């Protein structure tokens, strides 16, 4: 389904690591953040998202309209510019982060009361479960 709407509970993450190394986020972050619960509280109303990803270390809100490019300084994580595009590609939402890093982006599908997330950067790409509270 295209309706992402819920609060998401992580229950798994698969090489979380090695994408925070292909953005080259310190070594001593990585260790604090690798095993780190998160929750994504999703608000989508048409095209626009608000998203919200806690943990108990950092704290992001993310907003943006679905088809609109939008400048991003990602400053909590390896802080660069980048020029973000969300967009459908059927039910899946697909983000590209265009600047230095190449492949850099995610991708959200729902099934169920399971979302999955893809983020990637470079070669590396870290798999995401959450359930639906």
Same mark, same amino acid.
């Given at each position: 389904? $295209?309706?992402?709407?819920?609060?998401?509970?992580?229950?798994?993450?698969?090489?979380?690591?090695?994408?925070?190394?292909?953005?080259?986020?310190?070594?001593?972050? $990585?260790?604090?953040?690798?095993?780190?619960?998160?929750?994504?509280?999703?608000?989508?109303?048409?095209?626009?998202?608000?998203?919200?990803?806690?943990?108990?270390?950092?704290? *992001?809100?993310?907003?943006?309209?679905?088809?609109?490019?939008?400048?991003? *300084?990602?400053?909590?994580?390896?802080? $660069?510019?980048?020029?973000?595009?969300?967009?459908?590609?059927?039910?899946?939402?697909?983000?590209?982060?265009?600047?230095?890093?190449?492949?850099?982006?995610?991708?959200?599908?729902?099934?169920?009361?399971?979302? *999955?997330?893809?983020?990637?950067?470079?070669?590396?790409?870290? $798999?995401?479960?959450?359930?639906?509270?």
């Amino acid at each position: 389904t $295209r309706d992402q709407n819920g609060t998401w509970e992580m229950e798994s993450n698969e090489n979380f690591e090695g994408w925070m190394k292909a953005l080259d986020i310190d070594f001593a972050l $990585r260790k604090i953040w690798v095993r780190l619960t998160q929750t994504l509280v999703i608000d989508q109303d048409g095209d626009n998202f608000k998203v919200k990803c806690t943990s108990t270390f950092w704290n *992001y809100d993310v907003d943006f309209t679905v088809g609109v490019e939008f400048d991003e *300084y990602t400053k909590s994580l390896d802080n $660069r510019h980048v020029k973000a595009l969300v967009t459908w590609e059927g039910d899946v939402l697909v983000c590209v982060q265009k600047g230095e890093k190449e492949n850099r982006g995610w991708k959200k599908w729902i099934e169920g009361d399971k979302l *999955y997330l893809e983020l990637t950067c470079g070669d590396q790409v870290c $798999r995401q479960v959450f359930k639906k509270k």
